[PDB]
Amino acid sequence: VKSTTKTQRIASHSHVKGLGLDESGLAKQAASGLVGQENAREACGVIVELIKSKKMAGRAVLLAGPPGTGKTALALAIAQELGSKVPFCPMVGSEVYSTEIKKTEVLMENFRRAIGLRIKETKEVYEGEVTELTPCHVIIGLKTAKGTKQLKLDPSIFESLQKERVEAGDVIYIEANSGAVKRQGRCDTYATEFDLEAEEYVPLPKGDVHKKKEIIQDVTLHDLDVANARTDKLRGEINKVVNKYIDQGIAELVPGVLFVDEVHMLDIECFTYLHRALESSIAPIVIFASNRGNCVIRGTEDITSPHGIPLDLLDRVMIIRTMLYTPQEMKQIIKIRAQTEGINISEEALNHLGEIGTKTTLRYSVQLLTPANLLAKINGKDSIEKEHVEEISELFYDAKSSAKILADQQ
Amino acid sequence: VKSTTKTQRIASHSHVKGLGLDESGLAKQAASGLVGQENAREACGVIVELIKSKKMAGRAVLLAGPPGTGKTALALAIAQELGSKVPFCPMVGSEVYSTEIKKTEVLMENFRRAIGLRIKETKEVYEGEVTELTPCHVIIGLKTAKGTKQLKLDPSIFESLQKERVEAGDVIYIEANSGAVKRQGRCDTYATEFDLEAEEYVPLPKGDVHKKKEIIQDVTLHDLDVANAKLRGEINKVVNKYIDQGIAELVPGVLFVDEVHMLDIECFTYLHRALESSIAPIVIFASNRGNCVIRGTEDITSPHGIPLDLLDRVMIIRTMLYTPQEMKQIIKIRAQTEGINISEEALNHLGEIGTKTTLRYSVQLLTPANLLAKINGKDSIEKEHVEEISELFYDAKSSAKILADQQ
Amino acid sequence: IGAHSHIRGLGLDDALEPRQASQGMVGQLAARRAAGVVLEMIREGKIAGRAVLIAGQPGTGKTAIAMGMAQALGPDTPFTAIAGSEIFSLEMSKTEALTQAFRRSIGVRIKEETEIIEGEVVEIQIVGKLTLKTTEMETIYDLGTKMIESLTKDKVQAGDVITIDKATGKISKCPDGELQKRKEVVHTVSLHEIDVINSFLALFSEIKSEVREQINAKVAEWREEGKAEIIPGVLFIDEVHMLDIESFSFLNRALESDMAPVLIMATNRGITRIRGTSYQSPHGIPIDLLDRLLIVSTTPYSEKDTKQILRIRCEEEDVEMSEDAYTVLTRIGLETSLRYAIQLITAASLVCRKRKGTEVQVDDIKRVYSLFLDESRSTQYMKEYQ
Amino acid sequence: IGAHSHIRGLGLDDALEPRQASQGMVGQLAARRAAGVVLEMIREGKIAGRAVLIAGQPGTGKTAIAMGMAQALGPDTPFTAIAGSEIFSLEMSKTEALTQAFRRSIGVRIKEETEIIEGEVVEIQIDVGKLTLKTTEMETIYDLGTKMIESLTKDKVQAGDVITIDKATGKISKCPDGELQKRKEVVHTVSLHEIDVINSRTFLALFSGEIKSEVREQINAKVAEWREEGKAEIIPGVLFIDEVHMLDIESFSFLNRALESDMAPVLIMATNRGITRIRGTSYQSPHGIPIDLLDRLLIVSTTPYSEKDTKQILRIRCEEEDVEMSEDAYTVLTRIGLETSLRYAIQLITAASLVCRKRKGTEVQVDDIKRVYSLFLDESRSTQYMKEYQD
Numbered sequence A: 001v002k003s004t005t006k007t008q009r010i011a012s013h014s015h016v017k018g019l020g021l022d023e024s025g026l027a028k029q030a031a032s033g034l035v036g037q038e039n040a041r042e043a044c045g046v047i048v049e050l051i052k053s054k055k056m057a058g059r060a061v062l063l064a065g066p067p068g069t070g071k072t073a074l075a076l077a078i079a080q081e082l083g084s085k086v087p088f089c090p091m092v093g094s095e096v097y098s099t100e101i102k103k104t105e106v107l108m109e110n111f112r113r114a115i116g117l118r119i120k121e122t123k124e125v126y127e128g129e130v131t132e133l134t135p136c137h138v139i140i141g142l143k144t145a146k147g148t149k150q151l152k153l154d155p156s157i158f159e160s161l162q163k164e165r166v167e168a169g170d171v172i173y174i175e176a177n178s179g180a181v182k183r184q185g186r187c188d189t190y191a192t193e194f195d196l197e198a199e200e201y202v203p204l205p206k207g208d209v210h211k212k213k214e215i216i217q218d219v220t221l222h223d224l225d226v227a228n229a230r231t232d233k234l235r236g237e238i239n240k241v242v243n244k245y246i247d248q249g250i251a252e253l254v255p256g257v258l259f260v261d262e263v264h265m266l267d268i269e270c271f272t273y274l275h276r277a278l279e280s281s282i283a284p285i286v287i288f289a290s291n292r293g294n295c296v297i298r299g300t301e302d303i304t305s306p307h308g309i310p311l312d313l314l315d316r317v318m319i320i321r322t323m324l325y326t327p328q329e330m331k332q333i334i335k336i337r338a339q340t341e342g343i344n345i346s347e348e349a350l351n352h353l354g355e356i357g358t359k360t361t362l363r364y365s366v367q368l369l370t371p372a373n374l375l376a377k378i379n380g381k382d383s384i385e386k387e388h389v390e391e392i393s394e395l396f397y398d399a400k401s402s403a404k405i406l407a408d409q410q
Numbered sequence B: 001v002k003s004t005t006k007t008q009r010i011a012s013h014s015h016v017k018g019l020g021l022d023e024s025g026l027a028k029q030a031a032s033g034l035v036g037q038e039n040a041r042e043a044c045g046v047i048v049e050l051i052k053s054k055k056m057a058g059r060a061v062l063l064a065g066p067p068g069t070g071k072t073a074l075a076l077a078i079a080q081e082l083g084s085k086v087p088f089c090p091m092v093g094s095e096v097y098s099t100e101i102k103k104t105e106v107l108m109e110n111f112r113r114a115i116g117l118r119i120k121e122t123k124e125v126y127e128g129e130v131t132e133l134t135p136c137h138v139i140i141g142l143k144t145a146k147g148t149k150q151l152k153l154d155p156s157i158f159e160s161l162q163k164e165r166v167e168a169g170d171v172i173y174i175e176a177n178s179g180a181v182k183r184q185g186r187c188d189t190y191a192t193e194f195d196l197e198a199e200e201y202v203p204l205p206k207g208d209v210h211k212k213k214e215i216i217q218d219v220t221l222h223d224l225d226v227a228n229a230k231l232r233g234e235i236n237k238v239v240n241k242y243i244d245q246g247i248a249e250l251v252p253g254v255l256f257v258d259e260v261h262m263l264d265i266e267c268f269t270y271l272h273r274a275l276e277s278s279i280a281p282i283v284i285f286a287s288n289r290g291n292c293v294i295r296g297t298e299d300i301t302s303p304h305g306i307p308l309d310l311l312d313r314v315m316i317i318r319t320m321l322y323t324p325q326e327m328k329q330i331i332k333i334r335a336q337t338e339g340i341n342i343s344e345e346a347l348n349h350l351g352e353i354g355t356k357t358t359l360r361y362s363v364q365l366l367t368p369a370n371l372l373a374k375i376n377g378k379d380s381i382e383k384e385h386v387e388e389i390s391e392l393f394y395d396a397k398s399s400a401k402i403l404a405d406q407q
Numbered sequence C: 001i002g003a004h005s006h007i008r009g010l011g012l013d014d015a016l017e018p019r020q021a022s023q024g025m026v027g028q029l030a031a032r033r034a035a036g037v038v039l040e041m042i043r044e045g046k047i048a049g050r051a052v053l054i055a056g057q058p059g060t061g062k063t064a065i066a067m068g069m070a071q072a073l074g075p076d077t078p079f080t081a082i083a084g085s086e087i088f089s090l091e092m093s094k095t096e097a098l099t100q101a102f103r104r105s106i107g108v109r110i111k112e113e114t115e116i117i118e119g120e121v122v123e124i125q126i127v128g129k130l131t132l133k134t135t136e137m138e139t140i141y142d143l144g145t146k147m148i149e150s151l152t153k154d155k156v157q158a159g160d161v162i163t164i165d166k167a168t169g170k171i172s173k174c175p176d177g178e179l180q181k182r183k184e185v186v187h188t189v190s191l192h193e194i195d196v197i198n199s200f201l202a203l204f205s206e207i208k209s210e211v212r213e214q215i216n217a218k219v220a221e222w223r224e225e226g227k228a229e230i231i232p233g234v235l236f237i238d239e240v241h242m243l244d245i246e247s248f249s250f251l252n253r254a255l256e257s258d259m260a261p262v263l264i265m266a267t268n269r270g271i272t273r274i275r276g277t278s279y280q281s282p283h284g285i286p287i288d289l290l291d292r293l294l295i296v297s298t299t300p301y302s303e304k305d306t307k308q309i310l311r312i313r314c315e316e317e318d319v320e321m322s323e324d325a326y327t328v329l330t331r332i333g334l335e336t337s338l339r340y341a342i343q344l345i346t347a348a349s350l351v352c353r354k355r356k357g358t359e360v361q362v363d364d365i366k367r368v369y370s371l372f373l374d375e376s377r378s379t380q381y382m383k384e385y386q
Numbered sequence D: 001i002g003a004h005s006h007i008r009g010l011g012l013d014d015a016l017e018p019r020q021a022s023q024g025m026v027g028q029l030a031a032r033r034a035a036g037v038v039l040e041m042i043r044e045g046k047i048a049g050r051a052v053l054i055a056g057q058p059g060t061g062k063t064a065i066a067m068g069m070a071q072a073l074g075p076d077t078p079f080t081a082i083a084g085s086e087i088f089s090l091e092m093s094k095t096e097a098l099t100q101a102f103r104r105s106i107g108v109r110i111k112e113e114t115e116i117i118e119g120e121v122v123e124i125q126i127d128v129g130k131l132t133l134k135t136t137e138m139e140t141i142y143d144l145g146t147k148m149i150e151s152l153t154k155d156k157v158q159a160g161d162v163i164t165i166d167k168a169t170g171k172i173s174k175c176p177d178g179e180l181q182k183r184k185e186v187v188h189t190v191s192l193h194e195i196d197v198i199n200s201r202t203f204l205a206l207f208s209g210e211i212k213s214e215v216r217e218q219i220n221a222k223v224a225e226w227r228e229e230g231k232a233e234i235i236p237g238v239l240f241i242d243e244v245h246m247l248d249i250e251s252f253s254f255l256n257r258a259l260e261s262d263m264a265p266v267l268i269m270a271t272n273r274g275i276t277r278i279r280g281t282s283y284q285s286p287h288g289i290p291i292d293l294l295d296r297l298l299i300v301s302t303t304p305y306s307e308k309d310t311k312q313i314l315r316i317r318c319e320e321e322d323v324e325m326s327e328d329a330y331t332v333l334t335r336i337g338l339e340t341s342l343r344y345a346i347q348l349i350t351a352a353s354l355v356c357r358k359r360k361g362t363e364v365q366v367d368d369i370k371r372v373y374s375l376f377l378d379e380s381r382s383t384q385y386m387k388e389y390q391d
């Protein structure tokens, strides 16, 4: 079915591809698009190992740190480290307070988004090593064990292949029955020292170009929810079918990571639901994140407990701190984000952006990039200079600065 | 349909017959039963001109002033100035959220009572100058341009005429199809210095006694709603049909909302949306507080409780306080309207009483004072009677002070 | 209705360089530059999943900048200005109020063939005829007495674009082509307009959901066919601090859709407790929404810009003012709100007409100032009483 | 398809004095006068709770009499001619079929509002512009168009060209000489069924049904609204059910229900069977009708046809078919219409015409008649010989 994921939520940290740790366990300065704080990264690796050892029975992770210190980045890194396709469901605690739907529905939906389903369906794929892409259309040669097998990939599937950024000398399979193209990687013939076997330089396929390959379909329970909806009855129906598929041996359940930011905004009832659900075996992780200390648990406006979580759940939570970062790490972070977004920026501009992030936050500094490059585009330049960053800083403000500006007069 | 109007509420301002300002724009000291409050009077005149110019585009008026300074009186004067039969519906916000009913329905009915209908219908009435009043089948002579007509009436119609205090030389019309006598006035033949043309000394009717008079009935939507007892909507459709036919001319009234500071923010939004429409009547507020907290917010404090949204569309008219002279004048006017003879020293004591507490208290003191004077066999009220009445009944402030003082 | 109907764009020239006085906007160069950046970001389509909140004290043109941006996006781009308190209404729940506010901003430009009775007037023929010339031919196209009166109302005889059996419009004397310009007028009808159409004292004496579903289906069908053109507009929510946490969550949800219009909010509090919950936050907005917010701050006004604004407004209200009157009004608008200053103008006009004058003097301005109290004076005077 | 397309009233008049030819109808004077009696009964309204049954052998004019009655009642009175077996359909039940038949027989003369802006065109003004229009009241040059002025130019200009709402232009006389922008009560007899079809959502529907009850309810409420207003004047039409004996006992009770309403149209039935089995029961009744309905039945017997009458009727039909034939060919056709059914004679007419054109003639001769007589047979002959093969 369709990938029903709020890409905008995780769109800010698509450069992170994993936790980036050594075999020993330590974390390097920068790896897999993760720079800066390392102790929390080692703790996240420990949590991943605990998951793989099946020791995370009814426990959770709570990431305590100031805003803009990589909490969501660390959760995404954990999700990546458990697998490339492992579901990740980032959420805020204030979104349960809906005006039409119940907090039960919102919490159930966010739980369902966080459980993956590996359905393997044997389908005839066009696995081959792309040789040429002559649109005469578009006839493409597919080198395989038999050899180059030229087939006309229709302009539509050719544009989908371009959406896969597929070039010559690349071993991929093109779903013919579904009319889709997906990048497996390049060919091992060009594997350099950084390119190894059975990786983003995959070897030449050994077999017929059209091979029935079990397509591992990564779909979440809520991804299957939208289809039938096009209701409680619908909920149960999919559950039984998925269960049966699991028993048969074609569907493998993969619990994901459910990240809840601003945990202090959940009521006592929501915490009870979270505890009840995470008590179950299938339940994914619940990675909390708190921007404050001791707060009064909402609903009971007399009792204050650490991080706003009730004691029954706090005693069953593993706490990981995060560091506030420094200008050099923040500048490296901005460099990575700019490379991901495709913006050329001067070093002095990077230093100014880093100091701005230290003043207000990393979120603001990251968000300032697009407007600055875009102002430079207006000016007719491709590179961002210091004056552009200064102008954008004096044009748009951050929440605290604006509030003070008003208070200065108020 | 019986007129559904809170006669008691407006009964205290029956002396008010208009705004009492000249054509130039400035207001005279005393006219049309209105004394003082010159600034607010001119403001009300300006608002009247704006309403008649249809330039009140989604706007309202807020009357700010201390208790007992004629805010309700000024609203009634505005309503009178827009027309004698223009609807006027006063209401204090504290009764929107009654234990039963629904705030929406209460505000709905309040709005309805403020929208009138000028139903002009041509009915052959017996408009003629009563020459003689023989009650036998009551052949009453009605002399007109055609001449005296011994139109045989019924004892019920004669009783109705007696209820209208119709005498000889009284130019009255007796709607023939309904047998209702309504005293238009006397004849212009007996007009004197005060008696004039086209009033309680109306001139001789020109034409046949049985003339199709274009009689206008003043009735608001709410009266029809109560008469027909959804149902409410159906009454609207019939009214629209009536207006479309060409005999119902809509006339928006004035909705006076006192104690506005104690109204829900939802009610404020509803009032805003209602006044957005073009057919909407003028919504006039009144308040006594300052920057009191909005009702349903608990943290935003805005002038007079009004939320900033509505209050950005509001024309504030300030009302001043009355000095002893004005208080005494107003008390004497109210006494005259009630038929009360009062001495000047009594009026002075009443004025100083009003200065301490309120004009309401001084006005209310009149009736018990007159009854006490009547008991002692005196036709007038002396200073002793007012002293005794003040010593008998108290005012909220003084009694509260007494209770707290002992505490 | 009315209000600030004098701005038809941001007036920031090109390359985000506000040219001071232009299409209304006569100040706030920083805010204008930011609004232009936001507009061209919207054009290039990288504002998805974002919003704009304009902070500033009352009377600094927060709504004016939003209206200018809406005009700059397109000549017929929908603009919907509501207030935070506007949602807690007796008839509709906050859900319905915000849904209506959103659908008010989603405009549909649907073509509609019409036989505009147009022609370059060569002679103003008086009920009767009216010579009209086009590239198609020239003939004495007949009009009514009121149609010719409106033709004289417009500049004579430039034009005129007389829509079929309807009013005219001044162009030049030169609309040409066919005497029957069978032009499919692209009517911009907002989703809410269609919804109300499918569904005169109704306000004195809310739509189920089936009508909504039918409206959505039909609009989608037309847009897909190529007849309609869904063009998201701009939704302005003044007094955003009045909104509570539950409505903020619905706003967050609605910003996720593909049809979501550009969301602009205005606030003037800072560090105010969220209406829902008991947690203080800037401008009373939950941080989940504040993180992805483009903040624009409107600076307070100076004397010369205030006087220019007043000049424009009097030009709009057909009132001539004495220069001393203009200076006194400017000083008033600096000591009090601009809104009160604008209110003063209409009352001064009637005060002038009372004495049968042609231009308002300072005396009328002072008389009306004494007549109608403003926000600050009324409170001060009331509390002192208490 | 195009049968009975010449029966314009009963053509008797003269205080119930049927003329031999009148307007198309020739012969069957007996039943014609009886129909005239019924016609006055409809006008006087003393037919409520009663029905008419025309008995007679096939092809004697029973359907033609019904067509004349509707025309005689009014130029636009609705007429519904259905067959008894038409109710046995798999799509609709007997209830739905009969309900639909009654609906289309119930006509409503909705006096549609038409703002007729007509007027003798003094000058054809091009075009979206106006057009010089003049009437007896005043000359008010009025609004026009291009596709419309194209129609006006395509029409006779100038010949009045009465314009109704900017759709029609009557080029009769210079007659649009009233008020330039006047008003008209356009007579429109929309059958109750016709209103139903408009509301019904659904060009191949006949190939790839049944009106919903709620749809029926709404238009019934609507019809009352216009009727009270004064726009719609319900006109009771004539419903003709051929082959009435085909209907079964259950349907007959339904007819009783529908005939006891103020909207019930005059029911005319036709059958050529004597005492037969009542469908749906095990009894024998005259005409295959239950006694309850038969008691209150105005039964008129159509006499068989005479020689000269058949010849005259043929003469009328050929004029509709634009066929010129010899007198001998006429007589042979009349003889055919005597030994066999009149319908068979009409069928031969058109077929013989193409015979004449085959030899490139103008007037059909006796030779052609025999050529088509041998080609296409009559139901009696086909059945006669064809059973002969069986034994």
Ligand SMILES: Nc1ncnc2c1ncn2[C@@H]1O[C@H](COP(=O)(O)OP(=O)(O)O)[C@@H](O)[C@H]1O
Binding pocket: A012, A013, A016, A033, A034, A035, A036, A037, A066, A067, A068, A069, A070, A071, A072, A073, A074, A261, A289, A333, A337, A362, A363, A366
């Ligand atoms: N360790 C990290 N590595 C790379 N990018 C990071 C890291 N931490 C934060 N970011 C950047 O910060 C932004 C996300 O903010 P984050 O701090 O993860 O959320 P939170 O404020 O909840 O901790 C992203 O744009 C991301 O690029």
Ligand SMILES: Nc1ncnc2c1ncn2[C@@H]1O[C@H](COP(=O)(O)OP(=O)(O)O)[C@@H](O)[C@H]1O
Binding pocket: B012, B013, B033, B034, B035, B036, B037, B065, B066, B067, B068, B069, B070, B071, B072, B073, B286, B330, B334, B359, B360, B363
């Ligand atoms: N300007 C005025 N002119 C004449 N009478 C007035 C005036 N103002 C008040 N009064 C009288 O004093 C009264 C009390 O006023 P009140 O009802 O307290 O006004 P509000 O409460 O609306 O300020 C009324 O009964 C009215 O007759």
Ligand SMILES: Nc1ncnc2c1ncn2[C@@H]1O[C@H](COP(=O)(O)OP(=O)(O)O)[C@@H](O)[C@H]1O
Binding pocket: C003, C004, C024, C025, C026, C027, C028, C056, C057, C058, C059, C060, C061, C062, C063, C064, C065, C309, C312, C338, C339, C342
């Ligand atoms: N840039 C501008 N150019 C011209 N008039 C303006 C401008 N900004 C505001 N105004 C006008 O000034 C008055 C007060 O500003 P307004 O937009 O109401 O303030 P705010 O929205 O900040 O409360 C309004 O009449 C508005 O139209």
Ligand SMILES: Nc1ncnc2c1ncn2[C@@H]1O[C@H](COP(=O)(O)OP(=O)(O)O)[C@@H](O)[C@H]1O
Binding pocket: D003, D004, D024, D025, D026, D027, D028, D057, D058, D059, D060, D061, D062, D063, D064, D065, D242, D270, D313, D316, D317, D342, D343, D346
């Ligand atoms: N009075 C008449 N005048 C002219 N033609 C008639 C007359 N009566 C019958 N016909 C002819 O006879 C046919 C009548 O159809 P008919 O067989 O009576 O219908 P049914 O199916 O009810 O028997 C028509 O084709 C018509 O041309």
